[PDB]
Design a protein around this ligand. Sequence first.
Ligand code: FAD
Ligand code: SF4
Ligand code: SF4
Ligand code: SF4
Ligand code: SF4
Ligand code: FE
Ligand code: FE
Lengths: 437, 437, 291, 252
Amino acid sequence: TKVVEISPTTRLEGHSKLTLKVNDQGIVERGDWLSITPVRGIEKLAIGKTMEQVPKIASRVCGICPIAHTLASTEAMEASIGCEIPTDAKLLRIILHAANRIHSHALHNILILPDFYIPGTEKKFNLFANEQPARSVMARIVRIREIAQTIAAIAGGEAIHPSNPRIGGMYHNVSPRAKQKMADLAKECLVLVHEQMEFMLDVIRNMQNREFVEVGGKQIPLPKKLGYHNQGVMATAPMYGSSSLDDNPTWDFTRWKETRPWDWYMGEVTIDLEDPSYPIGGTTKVGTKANPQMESCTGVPTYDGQPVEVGPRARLATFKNFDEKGTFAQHIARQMEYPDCCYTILNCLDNLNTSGKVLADHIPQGDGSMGWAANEAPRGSNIHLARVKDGKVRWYDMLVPTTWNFPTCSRALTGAPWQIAEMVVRAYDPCVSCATH
Amino acid sequence: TKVVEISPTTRLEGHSKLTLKVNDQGIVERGDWLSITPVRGIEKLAIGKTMEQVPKIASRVCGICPIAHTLASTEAMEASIGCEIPTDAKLLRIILHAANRIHSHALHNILILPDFYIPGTEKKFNLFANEQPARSVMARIVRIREIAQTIAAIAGGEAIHPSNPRIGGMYHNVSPRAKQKMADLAKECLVLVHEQMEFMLDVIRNMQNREFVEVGGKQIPLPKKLGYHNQGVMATAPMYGSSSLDDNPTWDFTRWKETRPWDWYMGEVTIDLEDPSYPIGGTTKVGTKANPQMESCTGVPTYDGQPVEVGPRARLATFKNFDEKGTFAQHIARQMEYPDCCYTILNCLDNLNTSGKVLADHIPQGDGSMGWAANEAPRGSNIHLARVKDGKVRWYDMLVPTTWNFPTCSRALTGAPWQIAEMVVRAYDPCVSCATH
Amino acid sequence: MIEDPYLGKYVTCVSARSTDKEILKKAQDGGIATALMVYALEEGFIDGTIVAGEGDKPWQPKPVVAMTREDILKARGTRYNISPQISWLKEATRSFGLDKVGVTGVCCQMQAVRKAQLYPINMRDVPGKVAFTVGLFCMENFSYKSLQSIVEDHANQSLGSVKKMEITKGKFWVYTERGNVATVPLKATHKYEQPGCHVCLDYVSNLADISTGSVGSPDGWSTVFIRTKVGNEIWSKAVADGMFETKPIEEVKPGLDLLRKLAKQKIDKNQKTVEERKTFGINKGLRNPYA
Amino acid sequence: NKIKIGHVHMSGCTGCLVSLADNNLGLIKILDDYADLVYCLTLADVRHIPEMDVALVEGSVCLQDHESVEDIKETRKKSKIVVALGSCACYGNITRFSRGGQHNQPQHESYLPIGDLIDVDVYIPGCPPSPELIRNVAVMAYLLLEGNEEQKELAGKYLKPLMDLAKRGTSGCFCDLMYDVINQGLCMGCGTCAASCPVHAITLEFGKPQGERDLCIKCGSCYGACPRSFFNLDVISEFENISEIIAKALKD
Ligand SMILES: Cc1cc2nc3c(=O)[nH]c(=O)nc-3n(C[C@H](O)[C@H](O)[C@H](O)COP(=O)(O)OP(=O)(O)OC[C@H]3O[C@@H](n4cnc5c(N)ncnc54)[C@H](O)[C@@H]3O)c2cc1C
Ligand code: SF4
Ligand code: SF4
Ligand code: SF4
Ligand code: SF4
Ligand SMILES: [Fe+3]
Ligand SMILES: [Fe+3]
């Protein structure tokens, strides 16, 4: 056993590292992927603040998925106080949610493609480069994300940190013109995401037929079971979410418990294996001490006493019994989620009444009861829990998808050549600012 | 890439073809299986007709599974108008349903066995031939189907296009003699289907241990992952079904959307690869133009924005987490459904009161509300949706199992030698008249 | 009288457009079909007219008996799917109590009216109460599912956003309210045509009092045939009253030469289909309504 | 010598084929001794229509589907005896109600029974058609082509009413009982029409037929079964002997 460390990780959101024990062949025996993002402490600073402010603060946990936290936080407040929002407010929230999932999955295409090969060649995608096919692909992705952000801005008030959601529904309904504009854009987007999806699935399928990849000049073998783990999955909806107001909620808070990294991470180790050629800048210096239990910045939520995988694959496994697992299965399931986003937007626009009410007539102030809301963020189940009393948050808790995925991905690192541990990581589409909040 | 086309397909129900792009080894790269059965247009001709007539017309969509359409259509009308049928009517419907599943799975044994091998030999089953073991197997299958049709005729009024179902329950309860007769036949049938099931599973298991099959004189390799796809599955019950009258319906109409073949099928191609020796009569001539988007006769229903697999494997995966996939897994799951049919019939007869009421005391005429009913037809989830107002159907829609399976099977064709694409198809037990309606 | 073998019987043919600017805002072409019916109503030539009103689904027409200028104007613009205009023809003379019925529609609907005038079969009071017919040019029509498939798939547009559709210059054109344009090659649309159109031997509504369409005239303008005495009386008086700008059709491009050619292709192709019906089977054929 | 039999599937539901198969070991007996199944897409891999002594043709013809029209013309060309198997082939049945407008072929609007496109020798009406009738027609077709003169005479007499039905027309409905039985002074109130109706559209009121025309799916069964449509006394009075002959032909 030797210990190699990659710090920082790259082509994901935010700040983490991989602390890896490897065998004499460089295959991970036990690896820890951990947040080293400072804890801004949103759960504790929320206490005493107003139920209107806390969702707008929680939004600023993450600018890729602010819709997830805005909606999950707002709907946790609504669940605690017992506020039923109007239909047209819900329809606008779903449109906002679906649009953001498009932009997020497409942004993630940008981050993972450099690890992938132009099918049938030994050339990797370089999306910066003004050459084909990369530039044509970048142009499609860029238009996809532009459409997505535009719809999000129209239905949510703002693409990043949406302003329209409020306790009890929305500040604004949209105009007949705005509704036509969103429909026009969704029609254009649906064709584009079908193209991007088929493109990505082909690239992934080419990856599954490869035997090695090139990292830092060297050939790295591709295990058949790359990224396999035995944690199973958790998901609350295929699209939107669930909350404790529902007749039959699809998440069970009696099965959840959160520990410190303590229960699940390695203690102190010393780095004795270093590779200065790891692109670009090498790995952690020999002699460095690391302690994942103490350095990890997240809590570890569990379901039935164990870490779980959340995210697109978790959703398709839970709701369609999708039956492939590991790194390339995760990539596949994410791409498959493209069309539902556009069909959902178009169906929601069809049902939206632009003269309809968007704010509940009565917003109660709460008595301290616990409520919770789950939003199926692009990366998986985002669960916010709250006690609101007299309009103030007395208790707040956030179980964010990448928080769930950190210990699970770690276990999935077993069997990988340490030089492609980052590829295992990127199939989770990590958001480490999310994970840490 | 070359394009080869098989038209028509054989040993399935109705009229389809396979339009296949293949690599230089003859392995499917992207294949389209599509209906070319004329659209009789049952959904549109239903509008304005009486809620009593429409289920008897819908029955005539298909004579292998008319129970599926008779029951799903009737129960869609009952769900739209809010009619609760009597217990003994429900018990008779379940007996009818279970009996038809027996006859259907056994008919499908006849269609698929010619592709299969007498275990441990290089001889294929020829069920026409008056030799053993084929003739003994045919005799068992024939008795199984005879028993099944007899029970169906007794409980359903007729084996093909059952006459007993009506809005509000059944025209007839059965006599004490009839109830004894159905029980006697189910006891005989249970022994026979246990034998047939074990026979079929052995044949299938022999297929999974083979490395090649012979098609048109040539050896065709058998891929290990023959028929694998990543669409997952959908199912509403292990046996009967669900409807919007249920307290907790097991199908979600907000997750469904139907497109034209447009979104999912290939556009225009030209056949440049022809094999005149394909048994018996060859493939489509070189130079023929094909256009699956335009020639496909079905709509494409989706679940969470994607095609799904329905049918026996979908049922066992949904309700028992059956965890094998692809062609031979589909065959296995279908055979495993034999005994539940006979145990269900015997339990239902046990509870049936032959003096009990079979027609609701009040049949409302409807106000235009939407109702839906799912019947788990032998080939999978058959979902009929209706708005009944003043005793007339104002809106009608049919999402039939083979309709669902068409785009999914297509994707499952990847990786198959084009000469065994039809084997991938037959594991879906296709009903193309069903699919098209 | 001219007795053209492809353009029917007519007195004159001009290029025209309504001088009513409100009508033109949403008219498909020159606003002739709206302008004539509004004018006939104001002048008392009709007391009501059957028009292709707005229906229950976007871009699905619903026939309606219109009896005010406002209701007539609601029917502006071409709906390229079936509108069963003649279904209100008798009823207009019953509960609506009209003495002078106007009728708008395509060539086959003009045919239906004249058959009812001459062979009324359970159409009492209809022969004598038809007062004024205006016929649109029509090459072919579509079911609503066809129109949906063409606009939503081939043009990739939402129906709720479409402001105008137009078949011209070999394409199906879709214009959206927010200002975008999409086209579909007509070759792609052929599978979707209503099959009963393939037996139609009438392009410029030969049997109407006045016929109007787009081909032969610039955009914003209509080609108009004035055919019957009813048609000539109403047109003359409307022109004299300032209701239309006109140009003789021979001074207009593409004009009557292009029009006569498309008429000829239509009849020629459909006459062939009519003929193939006779030997459609083996030793038997299909019915010919014209036999 | 076995005769050559095909099953041709037009716009049908395959329930007509199921009805043939529901002769159980009778079908296997016929395939063993009297007939070769040269064509049937549901059961065999012969891709194109071969020559046939008997074509059992189910379903009607969509006029807007080119392959379908070619198939039914090719079938008549390839076959000595053409059988409209079941009510869709005989009479249109539920495809009378087809009117287009459904994805993904909204132009697939018009359906005719096969007798409007080709000449049909024999009707087997019914929806579903009775297995026993299909069996009797197969056996008698064989006897008509491979029997002694006494058999070919019997077969010709047996099939005559089914050939007369093919010559009568291509329409079937509850109204047949009005037009051609009650309105003709021939109804005697036996109630057979009511038993044969597959959708319970017929009741008898004071001994006379009452048709629920908006339940009727236009299958033509009731007039067929009516003993005052055709009643060929030469055949039907010999019911005991003709039954014994058919049984013996199926015996082991
Ligand atoms: C299927 C269809 C096919 C056509 N094909 C051609 C062609 O090939 N060449 C050509 O020059 N013109 C064609 N036209 C006519 C052209 O599109 C305009 O309809 C015509 O020029 C009238 O325009 P306008 O400005 O005078 O009428 P407007 O003032 O815009 O008024 C519209 C009139 O059209 C009637 N109308 C609209 N839709 C329908 C409908 N589905 N069915 C019956 N009546 C309707 C309304 O009742 C009203 O009378 C077609 C029209 C239709 C409905
Ligand atoms: S082409 Fe003829 S039949 Fe068809 S809608 Fe136009 S005028 Fe009528
Ligand atoms: S006659 Fe009846 S059973 Fe035969 S093909 Fe037609 S619907 Fe099916
Ligand atoms: S079957 Fe009997 S009751 Fe019915 S029409 Fe014939 S003779 Fe009259
Ligand atoms: S009344 Fe019944 S048996 Fe007679 S044609 Fe109608 S459905 Fe067939
Ligand atoms: Fe937290
Ligand atoms: Fe359907």
